[PDB]
Design a protein around this ligand. Structure first.
Ligand SMILES: N#Cc1csc(NC(=O)CN2C(=O)CCc3ccccc32)c1-c1ncn[nH]1
Length: 331
């Protein structure tokens, strides 16, 4: 038999013999191992009875189908998909072996970043988001914990979307959305790279909206009327805020600006934040326009952005789901 069992913290990883010296980075649970066939490190993800519920089964199938479908240098790639269980009656675990990077984007927010590396990181996030939007996939739940970094600094994205600090007002207020809903989430990550404090740290959905209007200000009347009247009632009732200007939100001291190059790049950065951190999606800058911003466009590469783009969203019983995933694991 090809596999071998190894104990890792709580769970028992029973992987192939090609993967050796596993190291835990979990929560699915994630292990970092060495592939002996490919001669390089990989990331193994144990899906523990992934068909356990519709939320689990729907996302896991979504993450399966899309990764073997999509192929980008900013969305992590699948290298091997397998299961130790031979039959469907025995089927219990799905292992997703996929490309390994060096660190998490949270680990990066704890650091001082020069404009050169920061604007390149952000550029990369936009490239993947753009390419996802061209497949008809809008992420929505974009977060740093779901973005991985190499010591390059090259960037890749782990998940495909759908801790809540990075969701857009329209997502929070159930308005319905469009492509540029991921420009909000980036502006939350960019501003966090600056402050090092999380921008809108709300304990609940209602509490999080307060931390938006305190800093940015109560959105325009034109925006208000597009809401669910029942929800619109609540927002129109909340106190009015003048909304602090972006120099006051991101003061001089935050940015590295000792040289003239840095001084210019600091305003170009704040000019970007100001366009991304907008409450009304009708006034919020688009991915296409953001890549053309003087801060970002210095990295532009059509070979990456304008790359070729590559089924439904249905309910299934957990008996129906099982077979569905097993089918796509056996491929
Ligand atoms: N799936 C998958 C993954 C494919 S790659 C990857 N993670 C990385 O590449 C980088 N990374 C982390 O992110 C967590 C911290 C960490 C420590 C040591 C080595 C890599 C990582 C993951 C992952 N790590 C944690 N959850 N998911």
């Amino acid at each position: 038999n090809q596999f071998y069992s190894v104990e890792v913290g709580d769970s028992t990883f029973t992987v192939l013999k090609r993967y050796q010296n596993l190291k835990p980075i979990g929560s699915g649970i994630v292990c970092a191992a060495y592939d002996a066939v490919l001669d390089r490190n990989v990331a193994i993800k144990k899906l523990s009875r992934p068909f356990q519920n519709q939320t689990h089964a729907k996302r896991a199938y979504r993450e399966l189908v899309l990764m073997k479908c999509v192929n980008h240098k900013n969305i992590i790639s699948l290298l091997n998909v397998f299961t130790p269980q031979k039959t469907l009656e025995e089927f219990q675990d799905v292992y997703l072996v996929m490309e390994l990077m060096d660190a998490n984007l949270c680990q990066v927010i704890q650091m001082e970043l020069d404009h050169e590396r920061m604007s390149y990181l952000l550029y990369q996030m936009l490239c993947g988001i753009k390419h996802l939007h061209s497949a008809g996939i809008i992420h929505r739940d974009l977060k740093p914990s779901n973005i991985v970094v190499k010591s390059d600094c090259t960037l890749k994205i782990l998940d495909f979307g759908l801790t809540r600090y990075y969701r857009a007002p329209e997502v929070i207020l159930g308005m319905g959305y469009k492509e540029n809903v991921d420009i909000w989430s980036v502006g939350c990550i960019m501003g966090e790279m600056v402050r090092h404090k999380i921008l809108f740290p709300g304990r609940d959905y209602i509490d999080q909206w307060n931390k938006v209007i305190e800093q940015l200000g109560t959105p325009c009347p034109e925006f208000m009327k597009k809401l669910q009247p029942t929800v619109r009632n609540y927002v129109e009732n909340r106190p009015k805020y003048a909304g602090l200007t972006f120099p006051k939100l991101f003061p001089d001291s935050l940015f590295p600006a000792d040289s003239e190059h840095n001084k210019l790049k600091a305003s170009q950065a704040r000019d970007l934040l100001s366009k991304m951190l907008v409450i009304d999606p009708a006034k919020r800058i688009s991915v296409d326009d953001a890549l053309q911003h003087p801060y970002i466009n210095v990295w532009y590469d059509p070979a990456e952005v304008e790359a070729p783009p590559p089924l439904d969203e249905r309910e299934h019983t957990i008996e129906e789901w099982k077979e569905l995933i097993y089918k796509e694991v056996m491929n």
